[PDB]
Amino acid sequence: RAMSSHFHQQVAAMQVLNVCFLSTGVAHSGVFATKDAVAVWETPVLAMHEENVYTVESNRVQVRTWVKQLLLFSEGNPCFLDICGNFLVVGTDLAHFKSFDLSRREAKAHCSCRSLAELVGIASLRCSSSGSTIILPSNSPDSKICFYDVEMDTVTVFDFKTGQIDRRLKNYVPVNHFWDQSEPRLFVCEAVQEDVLILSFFISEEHGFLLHESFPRPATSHSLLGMEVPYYYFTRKPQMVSRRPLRDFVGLEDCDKATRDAMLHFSFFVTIGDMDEAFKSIKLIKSEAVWENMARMCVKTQRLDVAKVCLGNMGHARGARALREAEQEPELEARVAVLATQLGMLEDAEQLYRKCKRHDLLNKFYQAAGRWQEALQVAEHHDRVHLRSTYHRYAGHLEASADCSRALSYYEKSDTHR
Amino acid sequence: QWLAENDRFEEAQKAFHKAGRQREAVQVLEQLTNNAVAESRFNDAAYYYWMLSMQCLDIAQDPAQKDTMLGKFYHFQRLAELYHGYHAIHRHTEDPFSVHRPETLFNISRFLLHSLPKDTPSGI
Amino acid sequence: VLWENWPMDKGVFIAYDDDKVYTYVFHKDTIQGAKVILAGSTKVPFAHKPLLLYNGELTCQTQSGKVNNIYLSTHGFLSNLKDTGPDELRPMLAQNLMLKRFSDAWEMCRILNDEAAWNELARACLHHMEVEFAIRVYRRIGNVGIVMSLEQIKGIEDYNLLAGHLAMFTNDYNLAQDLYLASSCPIAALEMRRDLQHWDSALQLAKHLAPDQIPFISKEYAIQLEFAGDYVNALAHYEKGITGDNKEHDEACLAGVAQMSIRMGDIRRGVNQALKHPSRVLKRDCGAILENMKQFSEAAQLYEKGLYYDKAASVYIRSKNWAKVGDLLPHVSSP
Structure with missing residues (x-):
């Protein structure tokens, strides 16, 4: 089988169905897991956002308990839902998607209708915590990766073959992608050689895209599940979750939230060329x-x-x-x-x-x-x-x-x- | 340089010195002294330091760097005396036999100890 | 008590009483001063009396005329080790280390082929002032940044100075300071503190030994507090740090006081920096400080003044007054 696995809020769920809450270290077509509710799914994708459901029925977005809110697409079937932070991106395979804000009582559209084909099928969709960043265009996955900037309203495409960023690793094609659950600018990618290598990037508006980490996929790991501070989380080949501490974050695994935040600040200023900001951030x-x-x-x-x-x-x-x-x-x-x-x-x-x-x-x-x-x-x-x-x-x-x-x-x- | 690549470094230093060279001569001579001090050839270390002393004083013939080369001359002369003295002590405490008269070793050791109070040139 | 007779063994002496032979080992030269260390015990067959010890064989007379031999438990490495195992070699290595028997320790590490076992041997060899053999070990371990250091201090003859150096290489800085202050060149302890970045002890040691480091280490400590975040004791040290020769250093301390006090509530006492600023660099650093504490007061002033002068347009867009922004509009490179 495809083995549908997800990771969110330090909860890893993989179809067997192993669910791991790595915050507390307790281990018990698709499965979606949060801290409190676990979603197993007629939907191409379904998700819980506290008590909510994101049922994608025909050309519509529906909610019900365990009919609450409704959202209207004018744009084909979405089969991509991704909730991160307080924002949802609802994506299609038709070069169509939107970003809907969630900090309020209900789902509200933070961004309007868009066409990727105008800016550039779509392989898979993910979102950042802040929701300003919404992608693999395509049915085989393509080397290029596109990112739609909601605020400044353009698109940025990075080519794996050329290593070039166009604003509107050469033998690897992205197949999977996730985002950090705390830092909106931290992005990760799983690329299979056309073997498998994991690429983490920091998306800086003032500097562009930066190469943060580039490490081969672990032998016990086969797919990129995602990350959450301070570990890269992967599906382990038959605890079936393998957590790899970040290279910079080696040793600060048990530090405080603010200590790890300072480490993250240093990591970011390392992703950029600002050694000075990095050091001045790491001062206590x-x-x-x-x-x-x-x-x-x-x-x-x-x-x-x-x-x-x-x-x-x-x-x-x-x-x-x-x-x-x-x-x-x-x-x-x-x-x-x-x-x-x-x-x-x-x-x-x-x-x-x-x-x-x-x-x-x-x-x-x-x-x-x-x-x-x-x-x-x-x-x-x-x-x-x-x-x-x-x-x-x-x-x-x-x-x-x-x-x-x-x-x-x-x-x-x-x-x-x- | 023909002698240098032919490894005739002593003659090569002599050549650069005779050739007006004052960058190659000094550099090769300092390298040679460091080799001599590294081994047990302290007497050769002293002689090369002596050559450095007189050559550097010759260079000090230039009024531009008179002040900054009389200091080097005095320093290298003192090092020359110290190492030529220390060669006898090095031989005496290594060979199963003894070459020098006891009076001479006594006088050498006293002079060294009264000229090397708190700083030890390398190897001594 | 029968001292060890074997020529190469330094100072081991089994004591013995009735049904026991202890294996004490003197220790003349160590970093932590001399001391006597028990190495182990053993047992003696009833009705025996030791006569000689040599490599471990306790030639001991019986209650009838015949000299039987025993083998000290502590000295067991004498034989081959193919029979011995890793779990059997490790304690054997510890025993040989205690007895100052470095040659057997080297042989048994070569058999073990454990990096941490070699590292332990190296730490022991540093501990006992055995510089040469420690270098031999490290040259095999591969650690390069210490091979060069040890080859650098192999010339040192002074006992306390060498003691301090080999202490510092074993990352025990307090004992290092202790010895260095007893050596011929105490300022080395100063150098250690100053490198090790503990400028408070740097002041303490320097004041007693050198007065030249005093204002400069004061400046460095002040800057340490400033980058750290403190800006009161930092300012005080800056005041302490003013010299009379290095105008660079002098005005640097002046700027220090300026910036730390400006961070404090000193618009009147950091108001000096409006004047005390001796370089346009000082002015622009003040412009940083005058975008620091939500200035209109002197974001306005130092962007009107400094080589950051066009910056007054933003310093005053922060405010209402348009004289600065308009007048500077010709004197601006950002339309």
Whole structure:
């Protein structure tokens, strides 16, 4: 079967019918689940919004208890309903949809009739919490993803093949999509290679679309169920719900709502290039983890000025002294490489050393790591000054490992054997 | 550079020095001293430092940088004396035999200890 | 008490009384000062009396003439370990670590091939001032940002200074401070605090040792409070932070006072910044502060004044007065 699964308000329901309330950690054609009421569905899609039903009968939107409100489409059958926050998007497969506001007693149209075909079938529809963002056009899914901005009243289409945004990952096609249940600007996508990779984006009006997270689908996971702070939630291949903490949010899983909100602010300003806003947002959080996280952000953004204050907050005094010393070095990539060495990423440090051209430093780096052989490479082709010295250090190490034949050999190559 | 790629670095430093080079000569000479200090060749470390001292004073012939190179000259001379002194002590505490008279080691050790109060040049 | 006779073993001495042999181990050189540590116990067959200990074999006379041998429980790594298992090697590793037997510890870690076991050996090797062997370990663990550090401080001979360094590498900063203040170069503890960002202890240590860091660390601590959010003690430190040589530093502290006090209720005492501002940069920072506390007062003033001068149009659209906006309309690049 298709295995209709949904996730909303920290409730995951999948047809078996396993329902998981992950807030309290209690586990028991389509199923829709909320905190209190679980909807199993004549509708292409049905939903509870507190006691309400969103029955899509013919070209109409109907409500009844457990006939209350009615909504009129002039626009084909909708077969897409999605409630998030206090807004509903009712979407069709005919390039037609609307956004209806829900903060009031009843459903009221926040946005008018629209045609996607004029702006650009439709595969699936989802909504943000704020409801200002309403999409996969098509019966196979298409690589492009379209987003209709209600407030400024245009459309934005992002092409997977080209990575380009038109205002009116290249071998992957979006198949599924969800939104964060707290942040309207946080969007996620499941794309299958034409394998499966999950892409989370932040939609910033002032900056556009930003690449927030890009991680492959877990082996135990097969479909993208959605997310809610601070976990990516997936359907587990036969607890059948797999929760993956967000890469930035690693360690703040048990923090407060406001602490996690600050972490979200930092994550957003990371999605944008505002390191400054991110740091100034994260100013009252005493967990070393957060500082370590933005202390690899600094690595990935060659910005050591704010780095210094960070690895103070983390207790990594060794690294701080290292940076103080490296400040003497007459290069920019070099200091970053030293910093990276001090914070658990050797490979990037190697890369920046390669590009910096400070090959002697690369040589010392390989010697520090157990790269005793690569060191001889960089000594043989690049320094030709520490070659005697590189050979010497290697001989010393060989003596240290209680092998005194190769040790003799490198004593003689270094000419120090005498 | 032909000697350099031929690894004849001592002669190469001599060449740059004789060739008016004052960026290659100093850099290669400092690298050579660092190699010597890294190993146990403290006497060569002293001699290279001495060459640096007199060459840098020669460079100080330029009135532009007289003040900022007499300091380097004095510093390298003191390092030269210290390392040539320390070579004898290094030999004495390593070899199973002894080469120097006891009086000479005593005098060297006293001079070192009365010239190295709180800062230790590398290796000493 | 029979001291350990084996040449390479430093200071182990089984005490023994009746039906027990303890395995105390001296500890001359540690970061936390010298101490004596019990390593384990054992049992002796009734009617025996120890005579010599050597690698663990307690040559002990019986109640008739013949010297039987025993094996200390604490020293059991002597034999092969293929028979021994991981659950059997781990306590064996701990015992060998206590006995300061680093060579056997290395061999048994090489057998175990556990990253955390190697890491524990490394922490022990730092703890006992064994810099070289700790470097050997770390060079295999792969941790690079500490291999270079240790290779940097391998030259240090001073006992307390080296003690402090190896303490800092074991992330025990308080003991680090304690030792550094006893070493030849105490300002190193200062440097640790200043790097570690704890500027209050930085002031304390500096004041006792250096007076040059005083105004600058005062400035840094004030800025720390300002970015954090405090702006009273920050302002006071800013006042404390004014030097007489670095006009940059001096006017920077002035701007500090300006901004922190302006955040406080000081439109009269941050009113200085209308004048005290020595750079157009200062003026525009004040313009930020004068979009900070819902100003008409001096959103109006500093957007009328500063290099942000066209900004007075918005500063005054906030208000009714149109003199500023209209007069600036020619002096504006946003129609």
